[PDB]
Write an enzyme that holds these catalytic residues in place. Structure first.
Site, short mmCIF file in Angstrom:
data_model
loop_
_atom_site.label_atom_id
_atom_site.label_comp_id
_atom_site.label_asym_id
_atom_site.label_seq_id
_atom_site.Cartn_x
_atom_site.Cartn_y
_atom_site.Cartn_z
N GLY A 18 7.46 4.24 1.04
CA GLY A 18 8.69 4.75 1.62
C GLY A 18 9.97 4.33 0.91
O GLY A 18 9.94 3.59 -0.07
N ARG A 19 11.09 4.83 1.43
CA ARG A 19 12.41 4.57 0.88
C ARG A 19 13.34 4.21 2.03
O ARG A 19 13.83 5.10 2.74
CB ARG A 19 12.91 5.80 0.12
CG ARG A 19 13.82 5.51 -1.06
CD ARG A 19 14.17 6.77 -1.84
NE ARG A 19 12.98 7.49 -2.33
CZ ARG A 19 12.46 7.37 -3.55
NH1 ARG A 19 13.02 6.58 -4.46
NH2 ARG A 19 11.38 8.07 -3.87
N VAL A 25 10.33 0.87 -0.99
CA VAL A 25 9.25 0.04 -0.46
C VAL A 25 7.91 0.50 -1.05
O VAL A 25 7.62 1.70 -1.10
CB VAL A 25 9.22 0.03 1.09
CG1 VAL A 25 8.31 -1.07 1.61
CG2 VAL A 25 10.62 -0.15 1.65
N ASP A 131 21.37 -1.21 13.24
CA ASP A 131 20.60 -0.04 12.80
C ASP A 131 19.20 0.03 13.44
O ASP A 131 18.19 0.17 12.74
CB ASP A 131 20.53 -0.02 11.26
CG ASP A 131 20.20 1.36 10.71
OD1 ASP A 131 20.65 2.38 11.27
OD2 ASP A 131 19.48 1.42 9.68
C1 LIG Z 1 7.93 2.72 6.29
O1 LIG Z 1 7.18 2.10 5.24
C2 LIG Z 1 5.81 2.05 5.35
C3 LIG Z 1 4.98 3.18 5.39
C4 LIG Z 1 3.59 3.03 5.48
C5 LIG Z 1 2.71 4.24 5.54
O2 LIG Z 1 3.01 5.20 6.26
N1 LIG Z 1 1.58 4.24 4.81
C6 LIG Z 1 1.30 5.21 3.75
C7 LIG Z 1 0.64 6.51 4.25
C8 LIG Z 1 -0.63 6.98 3.51
N2 LIG Z 1 -1.04 8.37 3.79
C9 LIG Z 1 -1.47 9.09 2.56
C10 LIG Z 1 -1.86 10.56 2.88
N3 LIG Z 1 -2.93 10.61 3.90
C11 LIG Z 1 -3.30 12.00 4.18
C12 LIG Z 1 -2.50 9.92 5.13
C13 LIG Z 1 -2.12 8.45 4.83
C14 LIG Z 1 3.05 1.74 5.54
C15 LIG Z 1 3.86 0.61 5.50
C16 LIG Z 1 5.25 0.75 5.40
N4 LIG Z 1 6.15 -0.36 5.35
C17 LIG Z 1 5.94 -1.71 5.34
O3 LIG Z 1 4.82 -2.23 5.34
C18 LIG Z 1 7.18 -2.56 5.34
C19 LIG Z 1 7.11 -3.93 5.37
S1 LIG Z 1 8.65 -4.65 5.36
C20 LIG Z 1 9.45 -3.12 5.32
C21 LIG Z 1 10.85 -2.87 5.29
O4 LIG Z 1 11.71 -3.76 5.30
N5 LIG Z 1 11.19 -1.52 5.27
C22 LIG Z 1 10.28 -0.51 5.26
N6 LIG Z 1 8.97 -0.66 5.29
C23 LIG Z 1 8.53 -2.08 5.31
#
Ligand SMILES: COc1cc(C(=O)NCCCN2CCN(C)CC2)ccc1NC(=O)c1csc2c(=O)[nH]cnc12
Length: 295
Positions: A18-19, A25, A131
């Site tokens: 993510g962003r 991130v 936020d």
């Molecule tokens: C929002 O960020 C995330 C998205 C996903 C997530 O959704 N996983 C990836 C998805 C994988 N897809 C691939 C396609 N498939 C069909 C389904 C699964 C997993 C974990 C995240 N973040 C953190 O662990 C995180 C730790 S600290 C911190 C911060 O300060 N700001 C934002 N994020 C974080």
């Protein structure tokens, strides 16, 4: 708060997840552990990194993300990885979406308030998040545990009217955001989705006293708390310590909050019949357990 200085060679970057508010991130590995890395984009973001690093080291609570350490070439934060992703994706993300219960909804809001209450009780000065919104709320332990991240020190839907006024604000602005998040998880709707165009259209609306639609069949103690939280006058809003106490005591009537998210859900959004909306969650079990206790 003690923290590590990370050598970038020890970091093994996997994929972009993510962003956030600032930077990118990424999922990674460091010393066997699964970690998340917030990395710098522009050299201008440097001021925000000092603030977030100062704050995350200072804080220590089960409902706020762990900071493992910081690498300084390049400048990046090494934090705990959230396996369940953001709450925003769980609520409003891509199909297939997980099924969740009223118990989950209440527990998420309790865990969120617990983290914020901790921030408001810092010494010598309180920390205001500024936020609070589902993109900055993360899920772990099969969706049962919520963590707060992305300290604020496209948010108009959650922002208190005094904040975007440039006016003097206290920690009571965090309370307003919590009220919106509570409405959001109960209904599984995006707040002010019907209001199109850019951010100023929401800001104008909320400034006039436009609030989310009231919920059909919603328990009066929950409704009472929700509408209190989104008062125009910041004084009339309850403190987080009060919210934590109320929500703790309501959990008696919401069992099953520890069941992991595992069931599918095909979700179609109906229109609002009156000026009200039907909840996504069901309150039949609440009313049943309540009447058993009360007479
Ligand atoms: C929002 O960020 C995330 C998205 C996903 C997530 O959704 N996983 C990836 C998805 C994988 N897809 C691939 C396609 N498939 C069909 C389904 C699964 C997993 C974990 C995240 N973040 C953190 O662990 C995180 C730790 S600290 C911190 C911060 O300060 N700001 C934002 N994020 C974080």
């Amino acid at each position: 708060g003690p923290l590590h200085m990370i050598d970038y060679k020890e970091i093994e970057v996997e994929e972009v997840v993510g962003r956030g508010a600032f930077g990118v991130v990424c999922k990674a590995k460091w010393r066997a552990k699964d970690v998340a890395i917030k990395q710098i984009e522009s050299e201008s973001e440097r001021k925000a990194f000092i603030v977030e690093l100062r704050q995350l080291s200072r804080v220590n609570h089960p409902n706020i993300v762990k900071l493992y350490g910081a690498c300084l070439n390049p400048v990046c934060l090494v934090m705990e990885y959230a396996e369940g992703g953001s709450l925003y994706n769980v609520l409003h993300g891509a199909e297939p979406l997980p099924y969740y219960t009223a118990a989950h909804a209440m527990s998420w809001c309790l865990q969120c308030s617990q983290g914020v209450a901790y921030l408001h009780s810092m010494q010598p000065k309180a920390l205001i998040h500024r936020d609070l919104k589902p993109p900055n709320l993360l899920l772990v332990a099969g969706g049962t545990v919520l963590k707060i991240c992305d300290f604020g020190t496209g948010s108009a839907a959650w922002m208190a009217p005094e904040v975007f006024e440039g006016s003097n604000y206290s920690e009571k602005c965090d309370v307003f955001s919590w009220g919106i998040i509570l409405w959001e998880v109960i209904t599984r709707r995006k707040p002010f989705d019907e209001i199109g165009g850019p951010a100023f259209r929401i800001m104008w609306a909320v400034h006039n006293g436009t609030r989310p639609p009231l919920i059909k069949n919603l328990p009066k103690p929950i409704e009472s708390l929700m509408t209190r939280c989104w008062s125009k006058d910041p004084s009339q809003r309850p403190s987080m310590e009060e919210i934590v106490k109320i929500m703790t005591h309501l959990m008696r009537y919401f069992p099953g909050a520890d069941e992991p998210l595992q069931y599918p859900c095909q979700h179609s959004l109906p229109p609002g019949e009156d000026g009200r909306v039907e909840p996504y969650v069901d309150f039949a079990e609440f009313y049943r357990l309540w009447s058993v206790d009360h007479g």
